[PDB]
Design a protein around this ligand. Sequence first.
Ligand SMILES: Nc1ncnc2c1ncn2[C@@H]1O[C@H](COP(=O)(O)O)[C@@H](O)[C@H]1O
Ligand SMILES: Nc1ncnc2c1ncn2[C@@H]1O[C@H](COP(=O)(O)O)[C@@H](O)[C@H]1O
Ligand SMILES: Nc1ncnc2c1ncn2[C@@H]1O[C@H](COP(=O)(O)O)[C@@H](O)[C@H]1O
Lengths: 300, 294, 290
Amino acid sequence: GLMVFTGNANPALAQEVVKILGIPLGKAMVSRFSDGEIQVEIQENVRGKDVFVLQSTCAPTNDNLMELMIMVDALKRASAGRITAAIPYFGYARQDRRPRSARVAISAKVVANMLEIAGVERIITMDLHADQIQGFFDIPVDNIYATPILLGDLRKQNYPDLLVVSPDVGGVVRARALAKQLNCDLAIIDKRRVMNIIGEVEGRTCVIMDDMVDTAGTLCKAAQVLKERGAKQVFAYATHPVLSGGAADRIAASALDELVVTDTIPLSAESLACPKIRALSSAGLLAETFSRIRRGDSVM
Amino acid sequence: DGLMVFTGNANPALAQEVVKILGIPLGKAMVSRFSDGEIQVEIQENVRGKDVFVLQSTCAPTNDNLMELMIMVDALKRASAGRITAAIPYFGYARQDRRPRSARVAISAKVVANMLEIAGVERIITMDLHADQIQGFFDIPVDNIYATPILLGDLRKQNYPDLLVVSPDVGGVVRARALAKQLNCDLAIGEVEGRTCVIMDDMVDTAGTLCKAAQVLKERGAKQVFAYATHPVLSGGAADRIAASALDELVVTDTIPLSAESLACPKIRALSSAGLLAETFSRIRRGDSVMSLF
Amino acid sequence: DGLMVFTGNANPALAQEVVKILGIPLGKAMVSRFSDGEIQVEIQENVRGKDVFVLQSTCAPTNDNLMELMIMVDALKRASAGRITAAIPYFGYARQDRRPRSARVAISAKVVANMLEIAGVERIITMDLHADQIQGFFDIPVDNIYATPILLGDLRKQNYPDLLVVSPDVGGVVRARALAKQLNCDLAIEGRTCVIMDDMVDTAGTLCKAAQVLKERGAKQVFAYATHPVLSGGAADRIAASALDELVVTDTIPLSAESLACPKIRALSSAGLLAETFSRIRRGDSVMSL
Ligand SMILES: Nc1ncnc2c1ncn2[C@@H]1O[C@H](COP(=O)(O)O)[C@@H](O)[C@H]1O
Ligand SMILES: Nc1ncnc2c1ncn2[C@@H]1O[C@H](COP(=O)(O)O)[C@@H](O)[C@H]1O
Ligand SMILES: Nc1ncnc2c1ncn2[C@@H]1O[C@H](COP(=O)(O)O)[C@@H](O)[C@H]1O
C-alpha cells in the first residue's frame, strides 16, 4: 500500500527515503508548460494506495507549493486511498500572526487551508517554527525534531569546553533544555539600547542551535560578539538551510567556525563551495516517521 | 464611496488605468518579497467594511501572482473588508479544465477555484474564460466579460476589403461562424483567394498554430491575414515567430502585459481593456446589467 | 466479498445482469413511491462496514431517478455503509454545464454534483460523460468509462464493406479522426458505408439530417452508434422514417415502447463493462486500461 512521490524541491532526499523503506520512487512528471504553468502527470496506478508526497516548500516557495497542490489533486482524482504531505521545511511558517494588529496575512494559515482543500489528509513536518501552527490545521500534524541528528554530530566532534549560547532572549527556554541535555553551561546574548552577554564566554567553545538559518545575519553577528568576548570557537547547528541573500559568502567572512545543517533543503553550488557549511542526512528520520505512520494505517 | 481597488504585481499599469477611469486612487498596499522569496504583504490603508476589488491576472509568473492574490485576500479579510471581489482578467490554469481521456493529471483550474474560495473571495470577475464550464468550478458568483466589443470595434474601424473570417482549428468553427454572422462576411475553415482573412482566438501563446494558418491562407492567395486575441500569453519565442510570419498584424488586449521583445515586434498591437473593466466594476456596484455590454 | 450492489428504478434489468456476472445477489431494498408521489426507500438488509455501489442512471424521469439516488444514499449512509459509490451510467443534466453568453441560467450538472456529495456519495462511476469538464464539478473521484469497446466490438462483428467514419457536427470532428484512425478508414464532413459514432441520441434530429445529406450525395448505407439512448419526443418515428439503416445503442437507458417497436433500433449489453469496472475498482486495478 505505501507509495512515495516527490516534487522538484528535494528529489535526491526522496530517493534516500525510499531506499531505506525498500520501495521504488513513484513515477510522475512534475514539470512546466512553455508558459511556466505547472505540468503534472502521475505515471502509475495509485488506486487505493497509501500515498506520501515529499515536498518541502522552500525557494521557489510558491512554485513548490503549487507543485504540491497540483500533485495532490492528481493523486486524489486518480483515487489514491490516502494522501499525506511530508513537508520537512514549511514555507510561510514565519508568517503565523499579525503583529500589533498590522494589516498582514497569516500566510501559514492560508497554506494550511490550501493543503486541506486540495485533499491532503495529514501533515508531516520537521522542526516547525512555532508549535501553534498545528492549530491552523484540522487534520493530523506530525512535527519531527532533527535535534538527534544535530546532537549526534555535535557529540562526534567532542568539543571542549562546550557551551550552549542563546542568540536572543527568545529561545532561552530551549537553550537551557539543550544545555541540560549536554550538561554544559549556558550563555545568553541580548541588546538593550548586540551589547549584553551574561555568562562568561572567555575559554569556551560556543554552540548555537536553531530551526533554520536564512541570511545568516543573526548567526554571524552573534559569532563576532563571542570572539570579541574571547570565545575560542563558535559553531552553528540549524535544521533548515534556507540560506538566501548572499548568506554563504557572509558565512565565509564571519567569525563563525562552522555551520552544520540538514539536507531538508539541498545546498546551492555557492554553499557547496563554502568549506564552513556542512550537511547532515535527514533521510533516516523521515523514513522512520513514514514507517510509524504506515504501521498505524494497517491497524484498521 | 466604499469602493476600493487593490493590485499585486501582475498588471500594475492596467490597475492604474482602471482607477483613473473610476476616479479613485489605487488602494495603498505593499506587495513585495522577503529575501528568501516568500511574498510580503501589508495593506497600508483602512479597509474596514469596504467593498474591495483585487485586480490581478494570474499570468506568468503564474504561481507567484496567484499566491500574491491569496495572501492579499487573506490580509484584507483579517482587516475586516466588507466584501472581497477578485478581478482576474486573465485566469491562469484555465487550460487544465479536465483530465484528457482520464489521464492521471490534475484539474488545476478547479484547484485554483477552491483556493480562491478558501482564501475568502466572494465574487470573481474574469475576461474571455478559456472554458465556460470553469464557471461551474466555483460556488460563488462568476462574471465572465468579453473583449469582443474592443476587438470587433477595432476590426470594424480598420475597414478591411473582402473580409473573410477563418477558424484556424476545427474545434473553433462554432465561435467563428458566430463571428461571421455578426460581421456578415463569409466563413473559411472554404474559399480564400483575394480576400482579407481574420482569425479570432481567446488566447495567443506560442502562435505556432496562428502563424501556420497565416502561411497556408496566403499560399492559397489571401490578400492579408489579421489575428485578434484577448490574452497575449506570448511564450516563448512567440514575438519573434510572429515577426517572421505571414501574419500582417496581431491585435491583443492588455490583460497580460507585453514583454520587451513583444513591445519590439511591430506587428503586435495591444488595446486597453481598462474601460471594459471599469464599466463592469461600476455596473456591479450599482446593480446594473453587465450582460448588456456584450 | 464486502461488495454490495443496489439499484433504483432507472435500470433494474441492467443491475441484475451486472450482478449475475459478478456472482453476487442484488441488494435488498424497497425503492418505491408513497401515495402523494414522494420517494419511499428502505434498505432491507444489513449494510454496515460494506462497500456499497448504487447503480442508477439519472435518465428520464430525471428528477425522480435523481431523488431516488439521493434518498437511497442517505438511507445507506445512516445505515452505516462503510463506503458509497454512485454508478450513474447516464448522467442526467450533463448538457447544462455552463452559462452561455447572454443567459441567466443554472449550471445544473454542478447543482447535481453538489447534491450527490452532500447526500454522502464518495465516488462516481459514469459512462461517456458528455463534457469532461464535469469531472471538475466534483471534489470526489470520478471514473468516466467508455462504451467504445462494446460499440466497436459490434461494428467489427459485421465486416461492413468500404467503411467510412463520418463527423456530422463540427464539434466532434477531432475524435471522429481518432475513430477513423482506430479502424484505419477515411473521414468525412461518396458511395461508401458510413458509420457515425456519438455519446448519446436524444431527438435524433442531427443524426437524421446527417443520414439524409449522406444519402442524397451517394452513400450506400448509413449506420449510427451511440452509447446513451435518450430518444425523446418523436425520436423513434424520425429514425424509422430516416435514411439511417440502423441505430445501435447500449442498454444504460432502457428502451421505451416506441423504441422497442422500431426495427432500426438495436441495443447492446453494457453489463460486462460495468461488472469489469466494479471488479477492477474493488481490486485496485487500473480502469483506464480497458
Ligand atoms: N519568509 C520570511 N523571511 C523573512 N522574514 C519573514 C518571512 N515571513 C515573515 N517574516 C517576518 O518575521 C516576523 C515574525 O518573526 P518572529 O517574531 O521571529 O516570529 C513577521 O512579522 C514577518 O514580518
Ligand atoms: N499552461 C498550459 N500551456 C499549454 N498547454 C496546456 C496548459 N495547461 C494545460 N495544457 C494542455 O492543453 C490542452 C488543453 O487545450 P484545449 O484542447 O484547447 O482545451 C490539454 O491537453 C492540457 O493538458
Ligand atoms: N436536457 C436537455 N435537452 C436538450 N438541450 C439541453 C438540455 N440541457 C441543456 N441543453 C442545452 O443544450 C446545449 C448543449 O448541449 P449539446 O448540444 O449536447 O452540446 C446548451 O445550449 C444547453 O442549454
